[PDB]
């Protein structure tokens, strides 16, 4: 395996790692992830691993979405982490509504799709 | 060290920067002795005891949609040298992701960075060097490390001893030593049970005559990896 390209994190130590790229199958390194983003495992780092099949894991750092307080909305769901992919259904008081007939908003690599707002 | 200024008296290494231990754009706050220090994305070292790991409690914290949210804690584990440091994190708790307000155990050991005056490849003196320090892991903290480098070579070895949580010594294998990015000598290369290759090690060479060396090194038992903070001196 070369050099690990993580899409929103890199690798600690990456000054005395670097000259010694490509490693061995079997080889791993720790490595952290960027603001908005987080490991398969929920945390901010992890250990990257030279397989037979390239580096793993094969997304490292995922987007994680914190619900934004509604004004005009309920906040039953205001604090709670959400991963990459996953949506929810938006409860706006009555009279206020999603944009453009919406009914829920997803955790997409660049935030929440649509943003939530009533 | 988290309250006095850098005065030239105290014995080195005076000051270090925590960019590397401080995660996703947030802040690092460590406490110690009813005291505190915040850290935004130095810690003044210089009043602290040499050849020992100093402990501090630790708090990881982001801003999110106004709230301040906890990302992190646990111990902040630093042993300090003369021109260098080695910084390990002992996590204890991480932010609840159902209850954003609240944290979950979850422990995990991270050899998060390093610090002090590195050594440029065009200081390495000629001949050979041997460094004795410490080696360092989860609730292992009284490790030892033996290591020497042949500069002329360009090649280092070594062993880490006495670390209660693996009941083998840690061969650290043949490495050369490579000029990095910046300049500066650095060593890179394999961790051994005997002649089983278990993960690898790196080290940073320190002081303007290389009298110090810094780094980590990892082993793999099972699945379980286990990270280890290394550091010697002349």
Same mark, same amino acid.
């Given at each position: 395996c070369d050099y690990p390209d993580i899409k929103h994190g890199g690798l600690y130590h990456e000054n005395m790692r670097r000259?010694?790229?490509?490693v061995a199958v079997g080889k791993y390194y720790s490595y952290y992830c960027d603001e908005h983003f987080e490991t398969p495992?929920?945390?901010?780092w992890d250990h990257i691993h030279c397989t037979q099949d390239g580096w793993?894991?094969?997304?490292?750092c995922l987007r994680k979405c914190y619900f934004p307080y509604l004004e005009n909305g309920?906040?039953?769901?205001?604090?709670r982490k959400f991963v990459q992919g996953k949506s929810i259904d938006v409860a706006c008081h009555p009279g206020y509504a999603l944009p453009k007939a919406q009914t829920t908003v997803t955790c997409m690599e660049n935030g929440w799709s649509p943003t939530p707002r009533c | 060290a988290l309250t006095a200024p850098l005065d030239?008296? #105290? /014995?080195?290494?005076k000051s270090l920067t925590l960019e590397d231990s401080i995660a996703q754009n947030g802040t690092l706050t460590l406490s110690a002795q009813g005291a505190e220090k915040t850290f935004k994305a130095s810690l003044n070292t210089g009043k602290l005891k040499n050849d020992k790991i100093s402990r501090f409690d630790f708090v990881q914290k982001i801003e999110v949609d106004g709230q301040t949210i906890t990302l992190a804690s646990g111990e902040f584990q630093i042993y300090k040298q003369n021109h260098s440091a080695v910084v390990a994190l002992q996590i204890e708790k991480i932010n609840?992701? #159902? /209850?954003?307000?609240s944290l979950i155990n979850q422990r995990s050991f991270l050899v998060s960075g390093l610090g002090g005056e590195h050594t440029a490849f065009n200081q390495l003196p000629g001949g050979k060097a041997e460094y004795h320090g410490k080696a360092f892991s989860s609730d292992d903290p009284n490790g030892r490390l033996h290591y020497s480098i042949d500069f002329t070579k360009k090649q280092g070895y070594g062993r880490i001893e006495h670390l209660k949580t693996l009941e083998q010594n840690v061969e650290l294998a043949a490495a050369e030593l490579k000029a990095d990015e910046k300049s500066h000598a650095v060593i890179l290369g394999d961790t051994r049970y005997g002649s089983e290759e278990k993960g690898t090690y790196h080290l940073a060479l320190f002081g303007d005559r290389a009298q110090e060396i810094a780094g980590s090194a990892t082993v793999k038992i099972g699945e379980k990896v286990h990270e280890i903070g290394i550091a010697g001196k002349q």
């Open positions: 000259p010694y790229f490509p495992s929920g945390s901010y793993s894991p094969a997304v490292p309920y906040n039953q769901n205001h604090g | 030239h008296k #105290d /014995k080195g290494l609840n992701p #159902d /209850k954003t307000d």
